[PDB]
Amino acid sequence: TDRVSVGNLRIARVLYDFVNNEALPGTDIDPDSFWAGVDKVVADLTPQNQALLNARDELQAQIDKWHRRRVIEPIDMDAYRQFLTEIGYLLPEPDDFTITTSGVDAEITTTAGPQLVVPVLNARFALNAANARWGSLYDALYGTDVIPETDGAEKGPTYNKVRGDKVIAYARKFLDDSVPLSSGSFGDATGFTVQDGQLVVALPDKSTGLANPGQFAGYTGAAESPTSVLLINHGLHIEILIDPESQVGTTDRAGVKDVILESAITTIMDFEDSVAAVDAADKVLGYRNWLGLNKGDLAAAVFLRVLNRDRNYTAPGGGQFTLPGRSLMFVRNVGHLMTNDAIVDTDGSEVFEGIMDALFTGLIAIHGLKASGPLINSRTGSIYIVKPKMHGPAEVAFTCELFSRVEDVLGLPQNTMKIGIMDEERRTTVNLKACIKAAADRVVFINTGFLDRTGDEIHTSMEAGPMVRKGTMKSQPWILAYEDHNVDAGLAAGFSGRAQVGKGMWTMTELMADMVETKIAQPRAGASTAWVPSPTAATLHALHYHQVDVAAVQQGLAGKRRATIEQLLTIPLAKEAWAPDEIREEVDNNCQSILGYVVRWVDQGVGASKVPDIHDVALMEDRATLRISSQLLANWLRHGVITSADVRASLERMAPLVDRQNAGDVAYRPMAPNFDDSIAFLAAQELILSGAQQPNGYTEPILHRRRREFKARAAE
Template sequence: MTSPTTTQTGYSPLGSYQISTELYEFVNNDVLPGSGLDKEVFWPQVLQFISDFAPENRALLSEREQLQSRIDDWHKAHPGAFDSSAYKKFLHDIGYLVSPPDQVELATVGVDPELATLAGPQLVVPVMNARYALNAANARWGSLYDALYGTDVIDQSDELAPGSSYNPQRGQAVIAYGRELLDEFCPLTHGSHAEAESYQIHHQGLLVHLIDGSNTTLINAEQLKGYQGDAEKPKAILLQHNGLHIELQFDDSHPIGRDDRAGMKDIVLESALTSIMDCEDSIAAVDASDKVAVYRNWLGLMKGTLSEQVSKGGTLFTRKLNDNRHYVSPKGQGFSLSGRALMFVRNVGHLMSSDLILDAQGNEVPEGLLDAVFTSLIAKHDLVGNSPFRNSHQGSIYIVKPKMHGPEEVRFSNRLFSAVEAILALPDNTIKLGIMDEERRTSVNLKACIDAAKQRVVFINTGFLDRTGDEIHTSMQAGPMVPKGDIKNSTWIKAYELSNVEVGLDCGLHSRAQIGKGMWAMPDRMAEMMTAKVTHPQSGANTAWVPSPTAATLHAIHYHKVKVSSIQKAMLANLGEQSSARLSDLLQPPLAAQTDWSEQQLIAELDNNIQGILGYVVRWVEQGVGCSKVPDINGVGLMEDRATLRISSQHIANWLLHGVVSVQLVKQRFAEIAKLVDQQNQGDPSYRSMADKLEQSHAYQAALDLVFKGCEQPSGYTEPLLHAWRRRYKQDIA
């Protein structure tokens, strides 16, 4: 195939298709070299792949719409009291519910231990932002002292306040906290780590000299894994507990170490074992140029070349991927540990299309198809050794596929990945699949979904936010929903979280794959996180999402306190078949028993939803920020992405549909809350205010569309409207 010539601005002909010239040149010049693939063979295969799968992709979306239409009609025909048994039978009859297979046994092989046998935090970050991506990749190791000193886990009042310069009293509180953790996780035969005067490697063991003149060592000698520097005076000592590493760092010339009895300057915890580099919910990539930028950053991660200039504290430096960490074992043998989290890449779902490639009729092709090909092609550089680092030592590519509806769509993704493996000359099942259990048709058919890709699945994860948005939209015609905050206490959410772990274990994910939990959304409230998020490992989940590297280090403490593998073994011993009652609970919409809320209550609920919508959408549409810490109506910073937006917009749309609130009241509150959001963003020089020009504000009009066109949006997703308004904004300011 000869190189194409440009026929219109930004596009080049390729067979019967038009391809973004920017994509074509990027793939040919930067991605294909070193991959073992020839462009003359690769591009025709890609076009055939699109031709083969695009019609089926569109058919699956059509099936979603048909099922939703039938569910809407059923609810309209059955107003009033909700009949669970009749509803369940109806869903079986239309194929929404399928009979689960009798026995499913996960058959995935070639899985790295970070996913199969270890338990620890997981970060999800927008790969479009190089700085965030690097931070997440490097969050494998984190300073416990820094995480404690800079957050509210340590009391911040009075003499323990951080202040503008180092507070020695706060520092001592941090050190005491760290020593208590060492006593709990790596106890000594006698005495405390707080009483240590020195640490040495002696006769292949750890020797700790205490202030009373005695020597002690670890109760469990096997916890000592290695050291750095001289055995008599090591620079670092590596311990292990519950599969996670703890590094004690020593330097008596360091500002902290010189005042420490043992010269210990820090305790470093192995933190984010895994990270998800997100091409989906947390980014705002709406056109070919945006997508190439996304792929370029992913390529930099896979080839180990991504870097970013960062200014911090008046100092400019280059951030890049961390090197491996090198140690000497107690027996004198050198070894290394990864300095980076194992990386997934999250592709987009089946819904959206992309102008990266246009078909013969000028239509955009399904974006999920393109992500499957290009993110996998890029990841091949890791497999063939084109990076100084290795992401997967087992030779796997890890892709999270979000927003799949039921086993048929999982089966489609499985076949999709097989076709990509053929194009890229990869062994079968090289591409591993992470299933986001975040749409109701998936959560009620989870066992069948896992069975549909049982040789690829390495991850299932609950997504309360998207699952709630889908619940509202699916049950839109059933009646008005309870206030948004009350949904967390609804019947289905409790069944959902339990079912995800139980079904995963029943399908053989124990010691073979991740079972995950959702995000802690308040990055400034770490003390609350430390109290609340321990329930995730206690529930049997071996990973859970955190909003920052600092949060990852703190959440890692929970995986030392709770041995997840033991929890899972105990659950396995008591597993029974999913009961009919559990399924009924999963299908129970969070309908309001009464709707006689006062006007004050309605306004409070609307204002909370609208503030979240406007605060997020104004950054998405007019700044291209897909995920950020957005202050809520009370000024509390919350990590917002499209999933939170989906809930808020669908909730108001539901109340409008059922006459709980009026169009006039909703519009009035939108106009009023726009003023508040403007005030909250007044310190941002790139922010464009809304309140003084509502009709001209792209963001404001987009927010109105999300609510007033909410019922007609496919599955209640926000992407179609956000993309349209972002594109319009980019065009208008060009």
């Protein structure tokens, strides 16, 4: 009695009102025509959506039976691959082709740099992420472990000048490495001037210019005493702020106050694995934040926080130009699996959620194409949607047809809605060229979502035998081939200069020294973007793109074929391998990370949490990391590595530790000692004990059911 009838649909009133009162005004779309289009698109495309999900089940059943029907020691790769071809899992590779996607912004086609992912249901996080286009290097260095807290350089309640001077020195070296002087070092600079459109750096006994004056991009203030100096390197901007009257500037030999880095070039506003949204009320919260971002007027509490305006500069010659102040925004829709009762049909059947996301996030994104102040997002006229968890090229073609039909409902030009393709399921990996071809006129990135991909690896081969420990997965042959294969397919499809080639998330949110040391591997592998968990991590990962010329790396990689199908298909089976203490560590680690994530998901609707692991390393958890942990334990239980008593005792042992870590939140409900009274604890148990039975190992069916159950209990 809380719904609105439109054709065969029954729409939750909160969603109907949100769309009519907030999303539609200003788009010139007729409300009656919009809702008729929703009815028609749902009716027309739901059968194919269901057909595709049934096809996954039929293929996995055949693969399950194949492994159970054999006894031979190692996979006979020739027989295995021929079988995958017969059942239509491995499809033929199409001829070479070049993508044709047009109307894409420079941040995607050309600029190499970090890409930030943030939960769209958290307005203050989403605001900080959009504002992360520019970030302080001094803050990122001083506040993290990139500068070690050795004797004398420790962080305290007040500024430590010994630490501050290490920060300054680190940044001066970065400047020398990125925008080198004709002679001397930035460490010895005493001042900056702009004379006849050229930057002049004062040294103690002479003056000098840049080795490449073309890296001088502009300044603020008067040319003869600028307030800042703007530089560019590998397409990314660097700004030296000059203020001798500041706390840090007073100590600096040139009065430098900070070094600002262009950081999160693009940001993915996430409706998928980092949020918990199980009904119309939840979906409206997310849609309204996405609306505020595109209209430019989102403002969050704690005083209030707003979106940054663009940045004004004087060109080296003399004109006034402007640089984007905000990250270019993508939105990650949900994939093809789930339904959501935000809309039900006349029989009470829930509507597919990915279909709804395309309609509603596409509608809302129109506001980002028009004046807010200037328009917020795409100046070239595109809407950028990340589509996750697709399995193979028919599922990509379906997304493209869904987008085409939504463009018609919205009165948008065909191919306005672009697609960032996650390569995060095995049947996409091994058919990647065909997947890109299916979206050849819409694709704006491919990205190795390696954590979902690991979950799919385990589930697909669940019946083959026990898998290696999850920490071993990152170095197994299949995943190394998968990473190279993805780059190869992108470059061969003409992505250089046209679309992003992306790699995955750094999850250790406090291990920033390790990130700076290690994550450089991604641009060295030819990735023009990769995922960071925070604005601070975006600023630090920006350093890697100044050190690595990704454009040159991609040109050197052109034409290579560095992964075979046999390599891609190498299942991560454990050899005949573990002492009891290693098995116990794996179980306790997986149970602790499952419980820490799931308890905040089910009881508080939080879809991404920092959860310390068994080694007290803080990890950003979302559904993909949960998918790995629950599938690994399900696999170990399936093949006798551990018993059902092992699992239960581990969960009961780790649950009170998770309770302790959450003891300060008035909204937290402890799981122990009354485990069977905690919907959250039972959800975590169900994710393991029923994991082998979930479709492709997905965690949403259980999580959504258990969160809805919790909401009902809290309302009675």
